Amino acid sequence: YVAHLASDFGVRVFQQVAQASKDRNVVFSPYGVASVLAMLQLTTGGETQQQIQAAMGFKIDDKGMAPALRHLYKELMGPWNKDEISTTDAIFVQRDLKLVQGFMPHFFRLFRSTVKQVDFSEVERARFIINDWVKTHTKGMISHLLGTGAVDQLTRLVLVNALYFNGQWKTPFPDSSTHRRLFHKSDGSTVSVPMMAQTNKFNYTEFTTPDGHYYDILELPYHGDTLSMFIAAPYEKEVPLSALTNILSAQLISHWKGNMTRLPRLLVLPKFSLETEVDLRKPLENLGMTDMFRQFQADFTSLSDQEPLHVALALQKVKIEVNESGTAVIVSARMAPEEIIIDRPFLFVVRHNPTGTVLFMGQVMEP
């Protein structure tokens, strides 16, 4: 339930970043941005708080909300994982501020984490701290946030979120099937990229938007069916991804599941290892949250009502890999009735099945 509101807020943010990155690759984490903004909520007061609660759909302070979030976190980091997913949130505030009495403990009570305190006048040092935090909480897979270059002796507050993902397929794509094939950029031009092939009974459904766009939808489960990737590919060229992403929801995903049946298909899917760093300011402003980024409008008085505080920098960075698993003369396979060759731009969603949370989301315009 909290999972659903968090996922959907996170999709809304994705929509906005998709709107601005037409025809560009973009990988993103709905769960991530919602997790960091849930925490931001506590630091927040006034109308800046209103903007965030209204856009999110819940108040972190209300009962059951934070325990649900920690529940979810712990579950994601459980033993089923296997270094497939690393996540981390963090808020850095100017070291010697007159913080309000009792805020730090209350924050730890709710998030089992702390607001990190740094002297931003050391600049290079503060940058190293932020970049180091991410490095050490993502098993070294994410090491640097280009956007940190923007901090200076004036930064009072920074917010970051970083996640890596590379899952192990329930059924891996035989290594010998992988081959170089043609991809059609929306550009109208083309590129040859490595693609995987696997013949199986995939959960499948044809889907239509209310406004009449058609997409093929496949479920690819990961080991133990804890996680699943859903792939959504237009029926023919010309069908944009927008029509789909603009109604995307957790409920929509469950809807796809409700209609899927298992059919023997040859699937041909491109390998991809993509990285994306997004500056969350504009996307978040576009969802109502504009006060937080504004020096004289921002209201962070739950954290410190002494110095005027406001968010200088809000970043998410995601790296995601899709290959044959987690790691020959012949290539043999069962013949299949139909084939599904994903040789054009497509969307993917990684879902946590037990809760429905949308962990990752993206559009691949070129692998």
Side-chain angles (χ1 to χ4, degrees), residues 207-256:
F207 173 78
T208 313
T209 32
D211 70 344
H213 298 96
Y214 291 94
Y215 300 86
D216 285 333
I217 308 302
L218 272 179
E219 185 179 27
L220 291 174
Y222 287 104
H223 78 79
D225 303 80
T226 303
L227 301 194
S228 280
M229 186 160 74
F230 287 80
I231 293 186
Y235 203 77
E236 63 264 299
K237 303 172 204 170
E238 302 279 36
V239 175
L241 272 34
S242 337
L244 186 43
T245 53
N246 300 330
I247 66 184
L248 223 336
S249 141
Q251 176 50 66
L252 176 63
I253 312 180
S254 296
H255 175 87
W256 293 339

Short mmCIF file of all heavy atoms in Angstrom, two decimals, residues 207-256:
data_model
loop_
_atom_site.label_atom_id
_atom_site.label_comp_id
_atom_site.label_asym_id
_atom_site.label_seq_id
_atom_site.Cartn_x
_atom_site.Cartn_y
_atom_site.Cartn_z
N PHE A 207 -1.29 -5.35 -25.30
CA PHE A 207 -1.94 -4.34 -24.51
C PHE A 207 -2.25 -3.12 -25.34
O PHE A 207 -1.45 -2.71 -26.19
CB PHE A 207 -1.06 -3.96 -23.31
CG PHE A 207 -1.58 -2.77 -22.52
CD1 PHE A 207 -2.63 -2.95 -21.63
CD2 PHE A 207 -1.04 -1.52 -22.68
CE1 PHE A 207 -3.09 -1.88 -20.86
CE2 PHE A 207 -1.48 -0.43 -21.92
CZ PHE A 207 -2.51 -0.60 -21.00
N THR A 208 -3.36 -2.50 -25.05
CA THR A 208 -3.75 -1.28 -25.72
C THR A 208 -4.02 -0.14 -24.77
O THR A 208 -4.73 -0.30 -23.81
CB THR A 208 -5.05 -1.56 -26.46
OG1 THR A 208 -4.89 -2.82 -27.17
CG2 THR A 208 -5.33 -0.43 -27.42
N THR A 209 -3.47 1.03 -25.01
CA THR A 209 -3.85 2.19 -24.17
C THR A 209 -5.28 2.55 -24.48
O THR A 209 -5.74 2.32 -25.57
CB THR A 209 -3.03 3.47 -24.48
OG1 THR A 209 -2.69 3.50 -25.87
CG2 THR A 209 -1.76 3.47 -23.74
N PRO A 210 -5.96 3.20 -23.54
CA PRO A 210 -7.26 3.78 -23.80
C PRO A 210 -7.32 4.60 -25.08
O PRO A 210 -8.35 4.59 -25.76
CB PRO A 210 -7.49 4.68 -22.56
CG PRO A 210 -6.80 3.98 -21.50
CD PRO A 210 -5.52 3.54 -22.18
N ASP A 211 -6.23 5.28 -25.41
CA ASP A 211 -6.20 6.10 -26.60
C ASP A 211 -5.66 5.34 -27.79
O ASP A 211 -5.25 5.95 -28.77
CB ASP A 211 -5.38 7.38 -26.37
CG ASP A 211 -3.88 7.10 -26.23
OD1 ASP A 211 -3.46 5.93 -26.00
OD2 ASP A 211 -3.11 8.08 -26.36
N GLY A 212 -5.67 4.02 -27.72
CA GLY A 212 -5.47 3.21 -28.90
C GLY A 212 -4.06 2.92 -29.38
O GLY A 212 -3.93 2.45 -30.50
N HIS A 213 -3.02 3.12 -28.55
CA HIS A 213 -1.67 2.61 -28.86
C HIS A 213 -1.50 1.15 -28.41
O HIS A 213 -1.97 0.76 -27.36
CB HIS A 213 -0.61 3.53 -28.29
CG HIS A 213 -0.67 4.90 -28.90
ND1 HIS A 213 -1.33 5.94 -28.29
CD2 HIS A 213 -0.21 5.38 -30.07
CE1 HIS A 213 -1.24 7.02 -29.05
NE2 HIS A 213 -0.58 6.70 -30.15
N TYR A 214 -0.87 0.35 -29.26
CA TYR A 214 -0.68 -1.09 -29.05
C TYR A 214 0.79 -1.47 -28.70
O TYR A 214 1.72 -1.05 -29.33
CB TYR A 214 -1.14 -1.85 -30.33
CG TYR A 214 -2.63 -1.80 -30.56
CD1 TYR A 214 -3.21 -0.82 -31.38
CD2 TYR A 214 -3.49 -2.71 -29.91
CE1 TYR A 214 -4.60 -0.77 -31.57
CE2 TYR A 214 -4.88 -2.67 -30.09
CZ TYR A 214 -5.43 -1.70 -30.92
OH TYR A 214 -6.80 -1.68 -31.08
N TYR A 215 0.97 -2.30 -27.70
CA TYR A 215 2.27 -2.71 -27.26
C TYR A 215 2.24 -4.19 -26.92
O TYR A 215 1.23 -4.70 -26.34
CB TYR A 215 2.67 -1.98 -25.96
CG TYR A 215 2.72 -0.48 -26.06
CD1 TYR A 215 1.59 0.30 -25.86
CD2 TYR A 215 3.89 0.17 -26.33
CE1 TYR A 215 1.64 1.66 -25.97
CE2 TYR A 215 3.94 1.57 -26.43
CZ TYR A 215 2.80 2.29 -26.27
OH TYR A 215 2.89 3.67 -26.35
N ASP A 216 3.35 -4.86 -27.21
CA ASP A 216 3.62 -6.21 -26.73
C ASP A 216 4.21 -6.12 -25.34
O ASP A 216 5.12 -5.31 -25.12
CB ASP A 216 4.66 -6.88 -27.66
CG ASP A 216 4.06 -7.31 -28.98
OD1 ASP A 216 2.83 -7.59 -29.06
OD2 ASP A 216 4.82 -7.33 -29.92
N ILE A 217 3.73 -6.95 -24.41
CA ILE A 217 4.22 -6.93 -23.02
C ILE A 217 4.70 -8.30 -22.64
O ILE A 217 3.91 -9.21 -22.72
CB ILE A 217 3.12 -6.57 -21.99
CG1 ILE A 217 2.38 -5.27 -22.36
CG2 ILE A 217 3.74 -6.37 -20.61
CD1 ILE A 217 3.23 -4.04 -22.51
N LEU A 218 5.97 -8.44 -22.19
CA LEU A 218 6.55 -9.72 -21.75
C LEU A 218 6.99 -9.65 -20.32
O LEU A 218 7.49 -8.62 -19.92
CB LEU A 218 7.79 -10.05 -22.53
CG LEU A 218 7.73 -10.80 -23.83
CD1 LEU A 218 9.17 -10.92 -24.32
CD2 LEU A 218 7.08 -12.16 -23.66
N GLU A 219 6.85 -10.74 -19.57
CA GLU A 219 7.41 -10.83 -18.27
C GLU A 219 8.60 -11.74 -18.31
O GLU A 219 8.51 -12.85 -18.80
CB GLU A 219 6.44 -11.42 -17.25
CG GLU A 219 7.03 -11.39 -15.86
CD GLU A 219 6.12 -11.95 -14.80
OE1 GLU A 219 5.30 -12.79 -15.18
OE2 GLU A 219 6.23 -11.56 -13.60
N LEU A 220 9.70 -11.27 -17.75
CA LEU A 220 10.92 -12.05 -17.62
C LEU A 220 11.21 -12.17 -16.12
O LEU A 220 11.58 -11.18 -15.47
CB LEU A 220 12.06 -11.32 -18.27
CG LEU A 220 11.94 -11.26 -19.79
CD1 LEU A 220 13.06 -10.39 -20.35
CD2 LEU A 220 12.08 -12.70 -20.29
N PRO A 221 11.03 -13.36 -15.55
CA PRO A 221 11.23 -13.39 -14.10
C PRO A 221 12.68 -13.55 -13.76
O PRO A 221 13.44 -14.14 -14.53
CB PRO A 221 10.45 -14.63 -13.67
CG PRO A 221 10.49 -15.54 -14.85
CD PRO A 221 10.44 -14.61 -16.06
N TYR A 222 13.06 -13.06 -12.58
CA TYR A 222 14.40 -13.29 -12.06
C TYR A 222 14.39 -14.46 -11.08
O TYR A 222 13.32 -14.89 -10.63
CB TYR A 222 14.92 -12.03 -11.39
CG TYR A 222 15.31 -10.95 -12.33
CD1 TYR A 222 14.50 -9.83 -12.52
CD2 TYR A 222 16.54 -10.99 -12.99
CE1 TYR A 222 14.92 -8.79 -13.36
CE2 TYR A 222 16.94 -9.96 -13.83
CZ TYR A 222 16.13 -8.87 -14.02
OH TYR A 222 16.52 -7.85 -14.86
N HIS A 223 15.56 -14.98 -10.75
CA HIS A 223 15.64 -16.19 -9.90
C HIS A 223 14.65 -16.11 -8.73
O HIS A 223 14.51 -15.08 -8.07
CB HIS A 223 17.09 -16.41 -9.39
CG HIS A 223 17.48 -15.53 -8.26
ND1 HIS A 223 17.10 -15.78 -6.96
CD2 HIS A 223 18.20 -14.38 -8.22
CE1 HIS A 223 17.59 -14.86 -6.16
NE2 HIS A 223 18.26 -13.99 -6.90
N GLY A 224 13.94 -17.21 -8.49
CA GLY A 224 12.96 -17.30 -7.37
C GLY A 224 11.65 -16.48 -7.52
O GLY A 224 10.78 -16.50 -6.64
N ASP A 225 11.53 -15.73 -8.60
CA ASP A 225 10.34 -14.92 -8.90
C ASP A 225 10.12 -13.80 -7.89
O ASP A 225 9.03 -13.28 -7.80
CB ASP A 225 9.10 -15.79 -9.08
CG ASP A 225 9.26 -16.85 -10.18
OD1 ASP A 225 9.87 -17.91 -9.90
OD2 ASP A 225 8.78 -16.64 -11.32
N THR A 226 11.18 -13.41 -7.18
CA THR A 226 11.12 -12.29 -6.26
C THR A 226 10.98 -10.98 -7.02
O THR A 226 10.15 -10.13 -6.68
CB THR A 226 12.40 -12.23 -5.42
OG1 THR A 226 12.57 -13.47 -4.73
CG2 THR A 226 12.37 -11.08 -4.42
N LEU A 227 11.80 -10.85 -8.06
CA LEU A 227 11.78 -9.76 -9.01
C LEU A 227 11.42 -10.26 -10.39
O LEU A 227 11.57 -11.45 -10.73
CB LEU A 227 13.14 -9.12 -9.11
CG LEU A 227 13.72 -8.54 -7.83
CD1 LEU A 227 14.89 -7.67 -8.27
CD2 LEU A 227 12.70 -7.70 -7.06
N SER A 228 10.97 -9.31 -11.22
CA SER A 228 10.55 -9.58 -12.60
C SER A 228 10.80 -8.33 -13.38
O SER A 228 10.55 -7.21 -12.90
CB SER A 228 9.04 -9.87 -12.73
OG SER A 228 8.69 -11.20 -12.37
N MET A 229 11.25 -8.53 -14.61
CA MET A 229 11.32 -7.46 -15.49
C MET A 229 10.13 -7.58 -16.41
O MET A 229 9.84 -8.67 -16.92
CB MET A 229 12.62 -7.44 -16.30
CG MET A 229 12.71 -6.17 -17.15
SD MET A 229 14.36 -5.69 -17.71
CE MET A 229 14.37 -7.00 -18.90
N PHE A 230 9.46 -6.47 -16.66
CA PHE A 230 8.46 -6.42 -17.73
C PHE A 230 9.02 -5.62 -18.90
O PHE A 230 9.49 -4.52 -18.73
CB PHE A 230 7.18 -5.76 -17.22
CG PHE A 230 6.38 -6.62 -16.29
CD1 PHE A 230 6.74 -6.74 -14.95
CD2 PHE A 230 5.26 -7.33 -16.74
CE1 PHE A 230 6.01 -7.54 -14.08
CE2 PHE A 230 4.54 -8.12 -15.87
CZ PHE A 230 4.91 -8.23 -14.53
N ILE A 231 8.91 -6.15 -20.10
CA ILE A 231 9.28 -5.44 -21.30
C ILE A 231 8.05 -5.02 -22.11
O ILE A 231 7.17 -5.84 -22.38
CB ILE A 231 10.21 -6.32 -22.12
CG1 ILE A 231 11.52 -6.46 -21.29
CG2 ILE A 231 10.44 -5.69 -23.50
CD1 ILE A 231 12.61 -7.17 -22.02
N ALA A 232 8.02 -3.74 -22.49
CA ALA A 232 6.97 -3.18 -23.29
C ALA A 232 7.49 -2.55 -24.58
O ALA A 232 8.19 -1.51 -24.56
CB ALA A 232 6.25 -2.13 -22.50
N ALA A 233 7.08 -3.14 -25.70
CA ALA A 233 7.59 -2.77 -27.00
C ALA A 233 6.45 -2.44 -27.95
O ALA A 233 5.51 -3.22 -28.08
CB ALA A 233 8.44 -3.91 -27.57
N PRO A 234 6.51 -1.28 -28.62
CA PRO A 234 5.51 -0.92 -29.61
C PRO A 234 5.33 -1.99 -30.68
O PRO A 234 6.26 -2.77 -30.98
CB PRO A 234 6.08 0.35 -30.22
CG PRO A 234 6.84 0.97 -29.10
CD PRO A 234 7.48 -0.19 -28.42
N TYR A 235 4.13 -2.04 -31.22
CA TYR A 235 3.77 -3.05 -32.20
C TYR A 235 4.52 -2.82 -33.53
O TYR A 235 5.05 -3.75 -34.12
CB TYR A 235 2.25 -3.01 -32.41
CG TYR A 235 1.69 -4.30 -32.95
CD1 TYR A 235 1.53 -5.39 -32.11
CD2 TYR A 235 1.35 -4.42 -34.29
CE1 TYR A 235 1.03 -6.58 -32.60
CE2 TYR A 235 0.84 -5.60 -34.80
CZ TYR A 235 0.68 -6.68 -33.95
OH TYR A 235 0.18 -7.85 -34.48
N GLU A 236 4.56 -1.56 -33.97
CA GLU A 236 5.32 -1.16 -35.15
C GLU A 236 6.01 0.16 -34.86
O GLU A 236 5.73 0.78 -33.83
CB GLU A 236 4.39 -1.01 -36.35
CG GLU A 236 3.33 0.09 -36.21
CD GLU A 236 1.98 -0.42 -35.72
OE1 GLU A 236 1.36 -1.26 -36.43
OE2 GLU A 236 1.51 0.02 -34.64
N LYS A 237 6.91 0.59 -35.76
CA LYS A 237 7.54 1.92 -35.65
C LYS A 237 6.43 2.94 -35.56
O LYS A 237 5.29 2.65 -35.90
CB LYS A 237 8.38 2.28 -36.88
CG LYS A 237 9.51 1.32 -37.27
CD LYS A 237 10.11 1.71 -38.64
CE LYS A 237 10.79 0.53 -39.34
NZ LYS A 237 11.16 0.82 -40.76
N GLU A 238 6.77 4.14 -35.16
CA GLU A 238 5.80 5.24 -35.11
C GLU A 238 5.05 5.29 -33.80
O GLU A 238 4.67 6.38 -33.38
CB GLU A 238 4.78 5.22 -36.27
CG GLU A 238 5.37 5.26 -37.68
CD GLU A 238 5.75 6.68 -38.15
OE1 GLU A 238 6.21 7.49 -37.31
OE2 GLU A 238 5.59 6.97 -39.36
N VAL A 239 4.79 4.14 -33.18
CA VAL A 239 4.10 4.12 -31.92
C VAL A 239 5.10 4.63 -30.87
O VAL A 239 6.09 3.99 -30.62
CB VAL A 239 3.60 2.72 -31.59
CG1 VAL A 239 2.98 2.66 -30.20
CG2 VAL A 239 2.57 2.27 -32.62
N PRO A 240 4.86 5.82 -30.30
CA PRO A 240 5.82 6.30 -29.34
C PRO A 240 5.63 5.60 -28.00
O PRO A 240 4.52 5.15 -27.67
CB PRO A 240 5.46 7.78 -29.20
CG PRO A 240 3.98 7.81 -29.43
CD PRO A 240 3.75 6.79 -30.50
N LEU A 241 6.70 5.55 -27.23
CA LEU A 241 6.67 5.09 -25.85
C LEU A 241 5.86 5.96 -24.88
O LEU A 241 5.28 5.44 -23.94
CB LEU A 241 8.10 5.03 -25.36
CG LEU A 241 8.84 3.72 -25.62
CD1 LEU A 241 8.46 3.01 -26.89
CD2 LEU A 241 10.34 4.00 -25.58
N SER A 242 5.81 7.25 -25.16
CA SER A 242 5.08 8.29 -24.35
C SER A 242 3.67 7.89 -23.99
O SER A 242 3.21 8.09 -22.88
CB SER A 242 4.98 9.61 -25.16
OG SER A 242 6.00 9.67 -26.13
N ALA A 243 2.97 7.35 -24.96
CA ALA A 243 1.58 7.03 -24.82
C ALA A 243 1.47 6.02 -23.71
O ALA A 243 0.55 6.08 -22.89
CB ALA A 243 1.00 6.51 -26.13
N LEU A 244 2.46 5.15 -23.61
CA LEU A 244 2.47 4.17 -22.54
C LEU A 244 2.97 4.74 -21.23
O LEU A 244 2.30 4.59 -20.18
CB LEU A 244 3.30 2.95 -22.94
CG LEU A 244 3.28 1.80 -21.97
CD1 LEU A 244 1.89 1.49 -21.39
CD2 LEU A 244 3.87 0.57 -22.66
N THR A 245 4.13 5.40 -21.26
CA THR A 245 4.76 5.95 -19.99
C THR A 245 3.87 6.95 -19.27
O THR A 245 3.85 7.01 -18.05
CB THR A 245 6.13 6.60 -20.20
OG1 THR A 245 5.99 7.58 -21.21
CG2 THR A 245 7.11 5.64 -20.73
N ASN A 246 3.13 7.73 -20.04
CA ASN A 246 2.22 8.72 -19.45
C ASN A 246 0.99 8.16 -18.72
O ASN A 246 0.32 8.88 -17.99
CB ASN A 246 1.83 9.81 -20.50
CG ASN A 246 3.05 10.58 -21.03
OD1 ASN A 246 4.06 10.75 -20.34
ND2 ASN A 246 3.01 10.92 -22.29
N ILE A 247 0.70 6.88 -18.84
CA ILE A 247 -0.32 6.34 -17.94
C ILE A 247 0.25 5.33 -16.97
O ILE A 247 -0.48 4.63 -16.28
CB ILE A 247 -1.48 5.67 -18.71
CG1 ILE A 247 -0.96 4.44 -19.44
CG2 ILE A 247 -2.14 6.70 -19.63
CD1 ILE A 247 -2.00 3.78 -20.30
N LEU A 248 1.56 5.23 -16.93
CA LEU A 248 2.18 4.15 -16.17
C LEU A 248 1.88 4.26 -14.68
O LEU A 248 1.93 5.33 -14.08
CB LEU A 248 3.70 4.10 -16.39
CG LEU A 248 4.42 2.77 -16.61
CD1 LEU A 248 3.73 1.55 -16.07
CD2 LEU A 248 4.66 2.58 -18.09
N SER A 249 1.59 3.12 -14.09
CA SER A 249 1.21 3.04 -12.72
C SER A 249 1.55 1.63 -12.19
O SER A 249 1.76 0.69 -12.97
CB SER A 249 -0.28 3.31 -12.67
OG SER A 249 -0.94 2.50 -11.75
N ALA A 250 1.60 1.48 -10.88
CA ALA A 250 1.71 0.13 -10.30
C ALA A 250 0.51 -0.76 -10.66
O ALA A 250 0.66 -1.99 -10.85
CB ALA A 250 1.84 0.19 -8.79
N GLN A 251 -0.67 -0.15 -10.64
CA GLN A 251 -1.90 -0.83 -10.96
C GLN A 251 -1.86 -1.28 -12.39
O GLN A 251 -2.24 -2.38 -12.70
CB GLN A 251 -3.11 0.07 -10.72
CG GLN A 251 -4.44 -0.52 -11.11
CD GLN A 251 -4.65 -1.90 -10.55
OE1 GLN A 251 -4.75 -2.08 -9.34
NE2 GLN A 251 -4.72 -2.90 -11.43
N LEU A 252 -1.35 -0.45 -13.28
CA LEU A 252 -1.23 -0.85 -14.67
C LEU A 252 -0.40 -2.15 -14.79
O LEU A 252 -0.75 -3.09 -15.51
CB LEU A 252 -0.65 0.29 -15.49
CG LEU A 252 -0.41 -0.07 -16.95
CD1 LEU A 252 -1.74 -0.38 -17.54
CD2 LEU A 252 0.22 1.03 -17.76
N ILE A 253 0.69 -2.23 -14.06
CA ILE A 253 1.49 -3.43 -14.11
C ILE A 253 0.75 -4.67 -13.66
O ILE A 253 0.80 -5.73 -14.32
CB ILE A 253 2.81 -3.28 -13.35
CG1 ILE A 253 3.45 -1.95 -13.79
CG2 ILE A 253 3.73 -4.42 -13.73
CD1 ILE A 253 4.77 -1.60 -13.16
N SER A 254 0.03 -4.55 -12.55
CA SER A 254 -0.79 -5.68 -12.09
C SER A 254 -1.84 -6.06 -13.14
O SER A 254 -2.28 -7.21 -13.25
CB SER A 254 -1.48 -5.38 -10.75
OG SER A 254 -0.54 -5.18 -9.68
N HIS A 255 -2.26 -5.06 -13.88
CA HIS A 255 -3.25 -5.25 -14.94
C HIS A 255 -2.69 -6.11 -16.06
O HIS A 255 -3.35 -7.02 -16.55
CB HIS A 255 -3.69 -3.91 -15.48
CG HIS A 255 -4.62 -4.02 -16.64
ND1 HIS A 255 -5.98 -4.13 -16.48
CD2 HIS A 255 -4.39 -4.03 -17.97
CE1 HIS A 255 -6.55 -4.22 -17.66
NE2 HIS A 255 -5.61 -4.18 -18.58
N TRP A 256 -1.46 -5.81 -16.47
CA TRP A 256 -0.76 -6.64 -17.42
C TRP A 256 -0.67 -8.09 -16.97
O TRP A 256 -0.92 -8.96 -17.77
CB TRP A 256 0.64 -6.14 -17.65
CG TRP A 256 0.75 -4.83 -18.33
CD1 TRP A 256 -0.18 -4.20 -19.10
CD2 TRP A 256 1.91 -4.01 -18.37
NE1 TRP A 256 0.33 -3.02 -19.59
CE2 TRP A 256 1.61 -2.89 -19.15
CE3 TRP A 256 3.16 -4.12 -17.80
CZ2 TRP A 256 2.53 -1.89 -19.36
CZ3 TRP A 256 4.06 -3.11 -18.04
CH2 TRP A 256 3.74 -2.03 -18.79
#
